[PDB]
Structure formats: structure tokens, C-alpha cells
Ligand binder design. Sequence first.
Ligand SMILES: Cc1c(C(=O)c2c(C3CC3)[nH]n(C)c2=O)ccc2c1c(=O)n(CC1CC1)c(=O)n2C
Ligand SMILES: Cc1c(C(=O)c2c(C3CC3)[nH]n(C)c2=O)ccc2c1c(=O)n(CC1CC1)c(=O)n2C
Ligand SMILES: [Co+2]
Ligand SMILES: [Co+2]
Lengths: 379, 379
Amino acid sequence: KNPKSDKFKVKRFHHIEFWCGDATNVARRFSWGLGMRFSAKSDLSTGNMVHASYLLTSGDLRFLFTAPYSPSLSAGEIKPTTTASIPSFDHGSCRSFFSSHGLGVRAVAIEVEDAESAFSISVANGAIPSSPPIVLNEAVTIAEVKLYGDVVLRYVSYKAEFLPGFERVEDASSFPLDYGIRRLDHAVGNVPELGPALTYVAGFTGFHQFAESGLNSAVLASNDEMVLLPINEPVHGTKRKSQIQTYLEHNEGAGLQHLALMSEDIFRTLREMRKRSSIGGFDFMPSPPPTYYQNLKKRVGDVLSDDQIKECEELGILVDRDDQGTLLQIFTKPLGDRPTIFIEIIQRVGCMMYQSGGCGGFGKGNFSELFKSIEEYEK
Amino acid sequence: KNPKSDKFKVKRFHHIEFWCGDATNVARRFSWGLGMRFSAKSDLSTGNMVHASYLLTSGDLRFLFTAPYSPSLSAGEIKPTTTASIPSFDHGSCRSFFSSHGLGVRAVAIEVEDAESAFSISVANGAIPSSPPIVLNEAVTIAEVKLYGDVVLRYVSYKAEFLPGFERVEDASSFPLDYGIRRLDHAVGNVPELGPALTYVAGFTGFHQFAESGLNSAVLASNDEMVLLPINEPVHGTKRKSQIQTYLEHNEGAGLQHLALMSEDIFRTLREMRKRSSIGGFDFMPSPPPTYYQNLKKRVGDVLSDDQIKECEELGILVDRDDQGTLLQIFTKPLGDRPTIFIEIIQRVGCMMYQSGGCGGFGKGNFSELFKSIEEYEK
Ligand SMILES: Cc1c(C(=O)c2c(C3CC3)[nH]n(C)c2=O)ccc2c1c(=O)n(CC1CC1)c(=O)n2C
Ligand SMILES: Cc1c(C(=O)c2c(C3CC3)[nH]n(C)c2=O)ccc2c1c(=O)n(CC1CC1)c(=O)n2C
Ligand SMILES: [Co+2]
Ligand SMILES: [Co+2]
């Protein structure tokens, strides 16, 4: 069931912010690898003496890449006189974040009706404040609370172009790449203990819980179930070591594990991304064995044709089925040096009337199907 | 003249090492932007719990990209029991380097006959030791001395595959990109005071000095003038602010300013790089005005045809002339967030009998030619 218990009005995912040591190189690699266009910047060329921030967009998906400049450039500034376009930015926090975790997500940003209200109600309901509400050029308000580890939930509200102080990039520099990615479907955290993490986040948002190998997890969802925030914990004591525990070890604790990006055509997206894997883009996890694709006919043969299921086989796409929809999904290798953050590409089919959130689930059934296919490929 | 005063036997440039916060993303961006292949790795997959290091190669050019892992992965190790493939690596030095300077060159590595001898003679002649000689698997010896700022000169000698502990990357991951770059021609440092820097470096190497707008510079060279190490200082008090001083400000002091990469066909290299500028590669400095290319006929018309000089005009190539050879050159925009390090692409024509080093100079004459062309394009 869906009690619609959101303690404030939540709209959609707004952006994901990566904290890096060099925003330029990460943003260029991601743009080519994922087919995202350069759309806005805030940096020295725009008067920002504090941080370099570059925004990539594909459909409604917004990826922001930020790194600190030398603190010496802004030594004369005080918070009232700052040239930073994102007032929550702090040199010491950013350098500490990146040296501790490496490349990763700092902020999961959701658009709300009123960011100051969302912040107040959140903290009144247990949220740990991270950055108080600040109004930007009488137009946009942003506030931040702690989510898990060093990741924050960022509230953004607009009265009536990304953020004040960001400039649109010249289209000579803005090449219209597009591989079909259209929006952020869900953002997943890894924590040591799932119980306290769930109680905390569900406590200050009012998100409700949305309807065996390595992990336990649960999905918090907004009223219309379009902001989806799953959380995982490790399952210790197994033959194979939990990838959640490996994450916590290499990340130095809790953090964002994967971003799932919805594509309007996952076959085109994966053809385009795989073309670029070895020339600067992203690698994908190893494909499942043919026994997997042999056994799909008897499970999804009603939704996908024999050509398409074979087209899944070339690209290594996995498929899972809910009682309401079907899910196409595939996972990249880790995005940076450490075995921590990765990306999932997904497409959902079903649950129409617009599409309802979570249609098809998150692919939990693909674990035992993978195990069964591996047990059957040695035969 | 060339006194051939090298205090030890120096061969050629061996590699350039970048210290980064995420080696993966920088190495992938550089590989696509410059047309360099992935050739070796030392990381978690090879047993290195200390640093991730990825090597790119194009012809004889070797770019190494290194970043630290969490120190927790190697907390039980001592220097005798280290899994680091580069024993000079230090987590604290690397994090301090990158937070201070951002993305930049840590090591300029030259191949010598005997790295222990080169280190001893260097320090006996004033070099500041950085890392003592260490023998790797009874096969390779590496030692490091301070060069300028936080940049070190790294000596490498081989008894008889990059370094012990590096693995060749699977050719499924190794795409054979090549845009024509073949070797490192020179590596240039920026310092506050040129005099003391020259006296220091020439003092411990025996390199000799190799034969007005913003800078003073001088070029130290090895016996055969194939290791070329120019150094710049700012010229203060001008109408336009020195780019050397801007470098020192944004870099937090002295460091490596530019790498010049020789191409066997600069026209093909710049066509290939410019195709990729807006899809993840490198941007170039603004092209000179047509008045420049109008005035080349009367200076290089004897070496380049009218088609090629027009082909220079499309690509924005600059041309300068020595009394012994001619030089084709162009500069990228800065490689990362800060206005610090950039790359020069060059091709030299002349001085044959093999090609002698520095053929054509370094393009000093292109300053006044550029000024004159700008004064003549408003007419
Ligand atoms: C991350 C993930 C998901 C997934 O996206 C989500 C889950 C799954 C319950 C985990 N719950 N929620 C909310 C999700 O968004 C689904 C299937 C997967 C994996 C995955 O990582 N590996 C490789 C790692 C195990 C070695 C797999 O083999 N399979 C089959
Ligand atoms: C770096 C550089 C070089 C060059 O490579 C080297 C030099 C030159 C004396 C500087 N000496 N040595 C040893 C060299 O390797 C040559 C010409 C240049 C520039 C350059 O940066 N800019 C733009 C900056 C000035 C605003 C220019 O307009 N011109 C024309
Ligand atoms: Co998922
Ligand atoms: Co040069």
C-alpha cells in the first residue's frame, strides 16, 4: 500500500552532484561515455573563485561535477561576499570527502515546493542539518541535510538557468551527444546497518517502504513513488564476500552505491555505450552465460520477441519480471579507481495509464536466475 | 656550443607521471583526447593495495596516471612488505600534491645508464634527494631528486615490462588509438626566479644551456640535446599580466607548465584531436588571425607549399624558423580545472643526418609575429 505520508511536497529528482579533484576530466569522460551534453558551468570564467562546477544533461538527467580551486584565490572572501555559486560548498569538506572516498556522489538533489519548509520540517523530524536554507538571487532556495555517510539530501525549490551564477555553455563547446538516457530512476546507498538508516531517513521525509546473495535492502519512496531511494546492508558470513562490505571497506564507510538511469531505448543506449567502452567510456559487468538467455523465453517470451531477446544476448542485458511490469537492466563496472560507485542502465515496460514508478521492481529475481544459469552452464 | 658536461650518462625521456585523485577518469580522457593506447596497469587487480597506476603509450611517449587508494587497504604493510609497484609513492605526499596543485605532473622520468650512480652524483652535486635508489625485482632501479616545486626528476635504469609489478592490459581493453604522437620533445617548468632554478638543476646534472612578452626562459639540455628541460620566470610590471605569474598563483607555486609532444604528422594529429575537442578530448588555444597566415608566405614559403600553409590555417598551426630548421606548433587549453598545465603539439623539419634536438627552436619568434598580426588585423 501507499500511505502518502511525505512530510513535505516532493516533486522529482533534480540533479546528482559528484565531488571530484578535477571536475574537467571527470565531466569530459562521463559526457563521452554516457552521451550527455555540456549545458552549464560555474568556474573562473564565470567569476567563481571557489569551485569549478560543470553540468551535463541528458533528457531530464542532470549530472553536476565540482572540484575546489586553491583556497588562496578566495582568501579575502567571507560567506556574505562569496563568489561560490553553490553556497554550501566548503574547500575542507570537499578535499576531505575526496581523499576519504575518492570519486563519488556528494549530493542527491530533489526538487521540492519550498526548500526552507522542507529543511525545517526535516530537521524538526530528526534530520541532521548540513547546510541551512539559502536563497539565490531571490529566485532559488537550496538546503541540505545528511542522508548517509558523507552524502547529503539536497532540497531545491524555484519561485518561478540551472542555478543562479551558472552560465549556459557556448554551443561551439556544447556537442549534442545523446545515447537515449532520459532521467534518474533511483539512487542507492550502502550502509553498515540498514535498520537505523531506514528509520532515520523515513523518519524525516515521511517516505514509505516501496513494495539471497550478499545483501539486505529496502526502498524508500515519495508519495507518487518517483523519488526512489533504496538502501543496502551487507549479509556477513557467506562463502562469497558481500560486495556491500567490499564497498564499505574501499569507500571508507557508507555512501552512494549506484545510480540507475532510465533510457527511452536501452538497446540503442547499450550499443552506443559499448562502442565507446575501450575509447574513453564505461565498461560493463561480464555478460551472463547463454543458459540465461536460453531460459528467458519461458519467462519474458510474452513481452519480448525472439529477435529482441537475442538482441538482449548480444548486449548482455538482464531481464526481470514483477507482477505489474518487466524490467531491462545492466550494470557498469565501477566508474573510478575504487570498487565503489557504479551505474545501472534500465528500461521499464508496463504500468501505464504516464508510467508508474518502480514498474517491474529492481531486479531482485535476477540473482537466483543468474545462479541457476551458472549452475546449468557447466552441464 | 655544446660542452657535453653531463655528469652521468643520460639516454632519453622515459615517462611522465601525473598525480591525480582518480587515475581512471583522467587516463580515459587523455587516451581518447590524445590518441594514446592503454598498455600497462598496476592496481588492485594486480595486487597493488597502495596506488592505482595506468600507463598510456603513443610511439615512444609514456604517460603514467597514479592516484592513492584508501590508506586503510595497506595499514598492515611496512616499506619492506609494500605492495606498491612504485616504491617512492606516499599517500600523504600524493594527497598533499593534488590538493595543493590539482592535476599536474609529479615526475619527469629520464632513462639513464645507472640510476644509483646518477642519484649519488646528483646529490653529491647539490640535488635535494627525494627518494633513494631502489632496485625492483633485480631488474630496474629508480631514484628521485627534487627538480622544482613539488616536481621530481626520476632516474630509471635497466639491467637488460614498463616496471616490475605492472601487467600488460588485455587487448580487449586495449584499443589501438593513434593520432600520430610519437615522443616527448621537451618539458617546461615555471618558477618564481629563473636564476636560482637554473643554477640548481644545471649544477647537479651538468646539462648545458641550449642555444618579449610575459617571461624570461632558458633551456637546459643533455649531451645529445634530446632531453630538453626549459624553465620560465615571470616578467612583472607589464600592461598584460604574465601567464607565468597566473600559473604560479593558481598552481600554488612552481611546477611543470607544458609538455611538448612530437608528432610524425602534425596535420593528422590536429585533425584527429580537433574532431574530439567537444566530445571528451582537448580544446586548443584560439587560432591566430588571417593576417598571420597571410604573412607566412614571406617566411616559410620555402619549406611549406601553398596548400600546406593553408592547411596550417584551418588547424590554427603556428610556424617559426631557426637558422637550422623550421618548427610547427600549437597549444592546448589547460588540461584540467586550473589555468596551469597545458600541452604543445609540435613537428620539426630540418637538421638531419636522424634529427638533431631542438631543430627550429621553441617558437620564441611567434610572439612578435602574433603581436604584429594582431596590430594588422584591425587594418
Ligand atoms: C545492484 C544490483 C541490482 C539493483 O539494482 C537493486 C537491487 C538488488 C537486490 C540487489 N535492489 N535495488 C533496490 C536495486 O536498485 C539488481 C540485480 C543485481 C545487482 C548486482 O549488483 N549484481 C552483481 C553484484 C552482486 C555481485 C548482480 O548480479 N545482480 C543480479
Ligand atoms: C608556451 C609558448 C611557446 C613555447 O613552447 C616555449 C617558449 C616560448 C618563449 C615562450 N620557450 N620554450 C623553451 C618553449 O617550449 C612558444 C610560443 C608561444 C607560447 C604561449 O604560451 N603563448 C600564449 C601565452 C603567452 C600568453 C603564445 O602566444 N606563443 C606565441
Ligand atoms: Co538498481
Ligand atoms: Co614549448
